[PDB]
């Protein structure tokens, strides 16, 4: 909607930074709204959904098991590991790790899962085989969120990420038990409160994953809809701002408020 686009543009002014935005019809996949659909932004923790998508693809192929339990060391822990910190003695299942990565944005959890599939290069390979020749993961946590200007490492485009999230949630790429599990994990997102969720009325469905990074980087991907069912995909990214976390949050929430008001 034209007015959501207006608010997007206003968000650039307020942050002094680029903003990427796309809006997809979940069914047809048709583009309903866009701004800088094809510029590159840092993915940030937003990749963790793509990651668990790769993990599920393997479960479907007999090359992994959600129940498999993984043990790790104090030396494996990186910055921000809210749930992995608490399981040094007993370890965690692939299931629990994917939940922790998507749901709590747990960093060690994501790393552990990257090891599972052969690292960043293999995630990028997986993406490529499904027709996304743009999205690319290059480093591990926490260094993938450095967002050096012009650096194309660890980036996607709003249009790609969205087309890709749709294929994962909706397409024949995963089995339906797996499509369901992916979206169930996003729906259970325990962070992202200050974002799109704060503009969502009761009764609306939302499954999402947020991302934060260096140099004012912030973003979110989501499937959302009225009447307890999702019907659109929204992808939002910004990088470059010098604004507070709170301030970058606010601009996000307000974009959502427009999206919803003008549904």
UniProtKB/Swiss-Prot annotation:
Disulfide bonds, paired cysteine numbers: 52-98
Effect annotated for changing residue 79 to K: In TEM-3, TEM-4, TEM-6, TEM-8, TEM-16 and TEM-24
Active site residues per record: 45 (acyl-ester intermediate), 143 (proton acceptor)
Positions annotated to bind substrate: 209-211
Gene Ontology molecular function: beta-lactamase activity
Impact when changing residue 139 to S: In TEM-5, TEM-8 and TEM-24
Industrial or biotech use: This protein is used as a marker in many commonly used cloning vectors, such as pBR322 and the pUC series.
Keywords tagged on the record: Antibiotic resistance, Disulfide bond, Hydrolase, Plasmid, Signal, Transposable element
Repeat among keywords: no
Recorded catalytic activity of this chain's protein: a beta-lactam + H2O = a substituted beta-amino acid
GO BP terms, alphabetized: beta-lactam antibiotic catabolic process; response to antibiotic
UniProt effect for mutating residue 212 to T: In TEM-5 and TEM-24
Consequence when changing residue 214 to K: In TEM-5 and TEM-24
EC number(s) reported in the record: 3.5.2.6
Keyword Chloroplast attributed: no
Function: TEM-type are the most prevalent beta-lactamases in enterobacteria; they hydrolyze the beta-lactam bond in susceptible beta-lactam antibiotics, thus conferring resistance to penicillins and cephalosporins. TEM-3 and TEM-4 are capable of hydrolyzing cefotaxime and ceftazidime. TEM-5 is capable of hydrolyzing ceftazidime. TEM-6 is capable of hydrolyzing ceftazidime and aztreonam. TEM-8/CAZ-2, TEM-16/CAZ-7 and TEM-24/CAZ-6 are markedly active against ceftazidime. IRT-4 shows resistance to beta-lactamase inhibitors.
Additional free-text comment from the UniProt record: The beta-lactamase present on pBR322 was cloned from plasmid R1 (R7268). The class A beta-lactamase family has a specific amino-acid numbering system, sometimes called Ambler or ABL numbering and often misspelt as Amber. A multiple sequence alignment was used to derive a consensus sequence and then the consensus was numbered taking into account insertions and deletions. This allows use of identical numbers, e.g. for active site residues, despite differences in protein length. UniProt always uses natural numbering of residues, hence there appear to be differences in numbering between this entry and some papers.
Family: Belongs to the class-A beta-lactamase family.
Protein name in the entry: Beta-lactamase TEM
Species, as recorded: Escherichia coli
